[PDB]
Amino acid sequence: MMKPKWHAPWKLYRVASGHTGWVRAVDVEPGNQWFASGGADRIIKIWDLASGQLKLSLTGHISSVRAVKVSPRHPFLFSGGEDKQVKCWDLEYNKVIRHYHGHLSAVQALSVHPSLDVLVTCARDSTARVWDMRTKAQVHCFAGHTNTVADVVCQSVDPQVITASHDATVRLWDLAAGRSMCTLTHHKKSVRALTIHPRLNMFASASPDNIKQWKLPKGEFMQNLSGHNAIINTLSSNDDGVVVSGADNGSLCFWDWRSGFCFQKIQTKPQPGSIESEAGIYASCFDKTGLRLITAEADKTIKMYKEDDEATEESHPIVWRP
Amino acid sequence: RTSFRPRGPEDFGDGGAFPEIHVAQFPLGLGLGDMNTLALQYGTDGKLQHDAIARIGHVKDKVVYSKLNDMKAKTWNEDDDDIQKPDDDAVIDATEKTRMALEKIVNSKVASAAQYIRYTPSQQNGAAGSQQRIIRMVEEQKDPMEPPKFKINQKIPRAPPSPPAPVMHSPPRKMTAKD
Amino acid sequence: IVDPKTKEIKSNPKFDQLFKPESGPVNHFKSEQQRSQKNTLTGFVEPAHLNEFHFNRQIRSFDTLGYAQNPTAESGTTHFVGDVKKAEA
Amino acid sequence: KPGGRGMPAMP
Amino acid sequence: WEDSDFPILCETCLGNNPYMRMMKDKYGRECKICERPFTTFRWQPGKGARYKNTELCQTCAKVKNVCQTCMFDLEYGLPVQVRDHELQIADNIPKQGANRDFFLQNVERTLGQGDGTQPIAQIANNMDQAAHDRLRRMGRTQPYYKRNAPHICSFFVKGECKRGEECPYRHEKPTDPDDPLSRQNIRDRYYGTNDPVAEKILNRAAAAPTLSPPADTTITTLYIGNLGPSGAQQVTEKDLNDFFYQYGDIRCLRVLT
Amino acid sequence: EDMTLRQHTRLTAALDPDLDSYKKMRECVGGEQFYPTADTLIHGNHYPTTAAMDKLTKD
Amino acid sequence: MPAPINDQAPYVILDTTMGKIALELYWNHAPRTCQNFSQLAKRNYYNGTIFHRIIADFMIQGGDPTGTGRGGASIYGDKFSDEIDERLKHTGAGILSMANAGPNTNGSQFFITLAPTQHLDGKHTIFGRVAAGMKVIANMGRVDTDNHDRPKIEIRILKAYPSESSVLS
């Protein structure tokens, strides 16, 4: 290894409750004012970021909402669910203006392209599908994977689409041609999560064996972030270099991206009346500053984490230990 | 050597045929027989490319991942050059290039539901005395009142997947019978 | 120095950087048809813009008289095609 | 717009 | 569906006039061999010809290296059955509907990785130079243009051509229906099975005279003739030396000018 | 994976190497190609003897 | 007493990704062509070049720094005249001959034969033969190529030095 950059501890500071089913998705508005959250109660809840107050609950999915993205360039929120629907919510009317139909089974994730008017969506049907945001046309179907596609993330340069699957592969896609120009086989188990580093040309992906870092655009393997032996199903990368990987058992490890050193291991507590089997984390997001981590939980709460303001290197030391 | 003649493959030694000896020289099997299987080959790193099998049937795509040293860990706290994000010029150039590339799909998808050609034929017996033809290609007028011409309710198996990417795992971790 | 054949040429090479002939022997096995420069299965298709009037004139001369002016670029000495005896007479 | 020169056929 | 700028055709189908008018019709026909709709091209190869049009699609042309109308091979101008014989290309191409539709899809995928200028692997990469020579030495060199004349006028066969000299169709004897050349099928001619004209070629090519060594295995002598008279027309002993030491070690060369 | 060690160690214990043919082959092939490293281009295809192909078939 | 080392060395040795090769240079048949090849080798001109052409049972060609087949030069300036002399012929495989874009246009590009080719005689200048490594040249002729006879996986040359004999190193 090499020298970790030091990162402050994160502490729990808010617990919003009000979903009646598992909170499956979270995303933060570009201006950082509010975050949406879908859940297994088939309702999308919009919450104020600074005060936690529930602005609005948007209802309209037939079953569990489990992808939610706020468009960086449009006044739109996109969401998909186990009912195979993908929906565009016009936030200037709080109404579903568009549907994207073609998925054959549950929509697992969706990602909204940072500079095109393009939306990509995963499903259990082992496809990622690319949508024209305007005309709802299915500009591509990425029929590469052989088991359900669990995550997708978009970026402006090639590979514009990266996809993770339960076949334990990650694939890099040519979005112009619509063909996978790389397959990263290194995971032993289902790859449920992806994150792209917001300021390095590098991305990460999680599976119960290992989180792996990858240099883009070729996707060559950098290093494992080893030892988080749980069904990891979220990855969030901070702007400063923290990465965090919440897991199905409700544990919540934070890592230095640069060294891979796991500096903190939170274990989440189920909120009252929930069973110890409900500790799990189903999604996480950073706020746009990168100083509030929002996590979505199997206990139907939304928990929020904040850097400990008073920590300093000499309070929480890192040595060298290669 | 001009007094000498080879005749057996061993007579040349390790060298090739002799141009000063005007006899038909076959320093190995070369030229004795007559002219499905790719040939094993050294790479530019001097290793032997047994994993050339993994490259058959691909469009020269990036999945050359077939060596252990591409599965071993690489630099930690990387050298800040390749790892830097692409610049604004790159994201702009990529956006426009990809935009117009998929515009051609969607416009041709929502529409789904003089000019000449100079031709240089290879069959040079040809048009009379001419290395080249030149032809006016008109477009035949479609009748707007004519319905779709052909059945397309056909269904056929998917194209087979692109050949297997090598599996590239960490070695197995031994299960005890306790596990 | 030289610039190989490419989908499009950006940088305007000199004559000697484009048209310098390929050195060395040539395949005994491939026929001249098979060695020929090509783009489709049977030849080099490329778009063209003729004058519509003169193009029509040359068709009808070949059809009706048996000869026409040669359509090739770089036609060299072969100025007429078809029944060249009538063209000269 | 900028562009480039397509190489034609030759004798 | 498949589309292109220009059809895969041989020069006898295009005619001697190097200036042509041609019509393009996207998806305008189904391919005679695979029913897939394909961009059709239609042209008249010179005056007195009929309007010809492309019959195969380009994948079926590429998967046999054949002209899209006449379906002769594009290299030698021979029928497929002759060429597939000499190159030992078996009847490998699937023929049943769903089976060969699947095959053609993979061909089109495979050729789409190439440069577009090659047929399928079997024929793009066949190297039997002796077989190439056998084909070259039997392919017709001149373009036969008579195969673009109009059809024979059935009303003239009925003896009642009511158009007279305005009739574009031919007023002449049909081919006798007992001759097997009158009874041809596009599928037979494409896949190269039971093709009448192929068998008439193969038989006459097999009937050509050939060298063959004698039973005298002790003989290693070749007579050489047509050397011309003595003098400046005669070949030198060096000429035979340079041409024939290519093949093997001459023990002796005797010149008889 | 452990049963194909139990098979393979059993099968290779039950295998008698013809060490006299080994030496004859070593002299014919030569030292360099007879002890090939991972990435030395072995030439000399070795298509088996029919006795060996039968021996493999029985195995 | 043996002659001192000088530019007219009898053998030149090349090392490649596929193999090490040694050539015997025919100074008494083509002195200008042999000295051209040696001085280019002495200037490391061939270092980093590739075999851009391979035709099975015919020819292996290399020695163009551009790898296009059109480039290359010579110590005399650019093109120079052939040294045709019919005491040498392309009598078999492993003949080394000087590749040219037609008569009197020799340059740095050289080709090695893989077959008896006695209709190329007089159109190219023979100037050596393979002295060692015909197994490598036999392997070179097995390398699969595209339809332009260019190897799909490159063979790269990166050594040039003269030697008094075919001994490998």
Added chain:
Amino acid sequence: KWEESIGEIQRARSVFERALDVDHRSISIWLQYAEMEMRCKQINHARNVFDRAITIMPRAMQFWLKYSYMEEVIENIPGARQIFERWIEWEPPEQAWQTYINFELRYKEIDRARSVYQRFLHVHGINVQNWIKYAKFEERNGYIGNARAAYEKAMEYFGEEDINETVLVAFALFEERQKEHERARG
């Protein structure tokens, strides 16, 4: 298998090729596809099947074992060496290197088997038992000077401050068994 039983080997091949499009990570299909070729004496087909299997799933020992064994039974033992060499290039588990050692020992190639150990300890040297097994091997072949040096290098490797009892006991019992009793006591 059924197409093989009817003698339709070309059909049987295509069926296995179509099976591999469905699951290319199934070791059973690659082995059954391989075994049917070598049942049919299709040794060059079988070699191509194994080269693909070991290319695609390099960590599955069953392909390397079955392939190198086939190439050994068929008496192409320099082919078998290169398979083991290519295996060792993946730095495989300890059990892989043992089969390469055992391969060389069955041909009485002691100096070859020695070289595998000296590479084996560069990879799996951390396991003291690999280090003791080497010195037992050098001892059992009578290279007692190498066996002694092997134990002395073991002590050096694991560090003469972080001293390892298992080396000391094994080394001491070795010198005892070589009658170097004053060294054993030492």
Added chain:
Amino acid sequence: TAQRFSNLMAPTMVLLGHEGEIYTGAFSPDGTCLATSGYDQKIFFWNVYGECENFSTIKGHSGAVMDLKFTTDSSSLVSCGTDKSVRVWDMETGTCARRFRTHTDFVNAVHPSRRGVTLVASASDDGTCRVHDMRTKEPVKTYTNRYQQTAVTFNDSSDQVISGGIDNVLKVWDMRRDEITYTLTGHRDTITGISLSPSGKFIISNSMDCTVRQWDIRPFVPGQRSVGVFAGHNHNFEKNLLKCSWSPCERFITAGSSDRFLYVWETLSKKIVYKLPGHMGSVNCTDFHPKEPIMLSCGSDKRVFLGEIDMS
């Protein structure tokens, strides 16, 4: 990275917007812009630099513009066409300053006097050279030759009119004598364009015989006036009036070609220096930028190509 030779936005620029065969194209002598026209009758102006935006488009001809030249001060564009008319277009106004309505057939070529009073030489299918003075409706000179004249230029002193045509011989008319003082004989077929060297010592003349011949037009020449012959280009069955032009340093010459290639020859050696591809039809007109090493080429393909060349 790669070498650059000009302020062009890219080493080659493709200018698109014409609707017909571009017969003619010229740079402004100040180097700021270029003007192009042909069968589509509109005259398109393009900046040489930046986006090369089509900043203006003059209209007014009722026929194809066969030839088009700037006046030397760049304040006016002369143009002539199949509407039997020469027109002078004011640059600052964009307007027809004069319309010499006096030819009786198609005007094939035009050339303004280099200096002094502005005179416009023109050659026509009526067989006449005419010199028009801006100040008078009537022409100053009418030189009736017997056969259709396709190309014209003044000499540099603007006191001889040089013309060629169907008779293949170039006439040189001396404007104080009103006689042909000498003729230049050597082309095998009809002349398609004549252009005058910057120094005025030499002219080139393109012909359907597929040669360019360089002629010495100086007052005294000690012998034969034929300086040399260039070859390589080709004229096809379209029989376009393929133009020709001089490099501003005179080291290089160009001519239009029907073979799609933009040909440059070196004046001293007569070797082809450039044979650039990229057009898809007859390259009808070619010109050099007056201050910077940039090539203009105008095709029958409705495309204009601008690009750098190494003028070494």
Added chain:
Amino acid sequence: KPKRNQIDYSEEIPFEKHVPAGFHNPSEDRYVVE
């Protein structure tokens, strides 16, 4: 009775996936049919 709604699988090899190219020449194998 005639059947035509499907390929007869015994007529020709169905959906034949051809064996890839490999370093060992497959045609050296001679198999005798059972």
